[PDB]
Homo-oligomer: A and B are copies of this chain.
Amino acid sequence: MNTPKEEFQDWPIVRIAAHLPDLIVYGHFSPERPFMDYFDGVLMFVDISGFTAMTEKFSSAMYMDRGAEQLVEILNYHISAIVEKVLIFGGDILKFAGDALLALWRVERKQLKNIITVVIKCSLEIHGLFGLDIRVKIGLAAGHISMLVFGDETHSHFLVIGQAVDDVRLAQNMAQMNDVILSPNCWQLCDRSMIEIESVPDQRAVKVNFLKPPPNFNFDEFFTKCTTFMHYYPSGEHKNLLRLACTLKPDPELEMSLQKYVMESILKQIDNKQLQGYLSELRPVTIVFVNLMFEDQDKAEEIGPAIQDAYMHITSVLKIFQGQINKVFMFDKGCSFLCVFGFPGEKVPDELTHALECAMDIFDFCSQVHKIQTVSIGVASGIVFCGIVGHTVRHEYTVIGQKVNLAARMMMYYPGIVTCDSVTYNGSNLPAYFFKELPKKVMKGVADSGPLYQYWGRTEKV
């Protein structure tokens, strides 16, 4: 009796799970919303500097209208290799955001010290990897982490919250190119007999200099010991897989739950109802970057209800005005929503007008939500890259472009109001007196925005 070749089976549930971390795929938690979970771990925030400039250049004539295709190919070639290292070292990629990603090693408290060594080794190998134009910056943090799941009956989003989350982003902001920076708490928890550092001026964070193994040390045996604490590390018969999620089997309940995290247009491609090519594009869109600030951004039980409340309104008005949520995460002393007008399928004219009217609506509503202290919204329009970024086994739909960064910086440098760039202003059908021309601020990571405006809106205020 034959024992024939079992082909890898690429069920729709496996393709869906590629868009999600193990934290969701294997979480089995309540469908109640908001839902909050608490744990400990190590976080790693990896940023490629320089793709957003490459993006601009891929629209030029030399790319012969295949700029989107060239960009996604070169981006994924690099990002894939980072994703593989994270996964082989036992991490869960939580999220991609443009040309950056956030990874987690969830463990019990007593295992933090050793897992931190694993994550540093991983980070140093990633620095190893990387025309001669892009750099990799890495921030690490460790400690208590909260997760929030929010959403409605057909859509789900999650994000992580707390000091370690705030620290991982601060650490990465300080990294100079090719640095690995540890948060103060990470440095306090780590194996100081192995990890040599250098102080960072005016900071308590530190920079990794090198690993100093002791005399008997064997990294592979140490790593094996740490894998005891890793619930989903592929092993035994599945030791040749990058993710245990590759072995998921059809299960309608689980798939119904997982699909709610993934955008319709991506589900259409998964279901072989649209060609893959269509979702990689360099197209004019409008970004609406919404920031919600709280008194205490580290306290999930406080902020969770508020984010849910805001989300319910946001999703409704985005649908009316033809926009979509691309990403949600903690940033800017708050929860930020990256919303997009003009994604695959969602084109119109008066897209600009809509973006602005939607932004004012969100601003008015969210400003009255209990515990939301300040709302800021940045609106910017231009050509942006949209497509699936990452590895075959772990990837997500994302946007990359100078206008994405501009909207986020506007939102940060002009708090408490709705602002817009020049393209949005000049293109909208709205009267000029609905706007106010603003003082120009020097803004970290933007060479020249053109004039910026406040969208003051309809009735006068003075």
Contacts and interface: CB of A to CB of B under 8 A. Distances in A.
A278 B274 CA distance: 10
Interface in A267-324: 267-268, 271-278
A255 B70 contact: yes
Given A69-B12, A74-B250, A256-B70, A2 B272 contact: no
From DSSP, what is the main secondary structure of chain A's interface residues? loop
Contacts of A69: 12, 271
Interface string A1-13: 1111101000111
A444 B223 CA distance: 62
A223 B1 CA distance: 7
Interface residues of A, number: 53
A155 B224 CA distance: 54
Interface stretch (A58-66, A197-205, A430-438): A58-66
A273 B68 CA distance: 12
A323 to B, nearest CB: 20
Contacts of A84: 4
A263 interface: no
A53 B74 CA distance: 45
A253 B64 CA distance: 12
A259 B1 contact: no
Nearest to A76: B250
Contact of A74 (B7, B252, B260, B271): B252
Interface of A: 1-5, 7, 11-13, 62-64, 66, 69-70, 73-74, 77, 84, 88-89, 131, 154, 220, 223-224, 233-235, 239-242, 249-253, 255-256, 259-260, 267-268, 271-278, 392
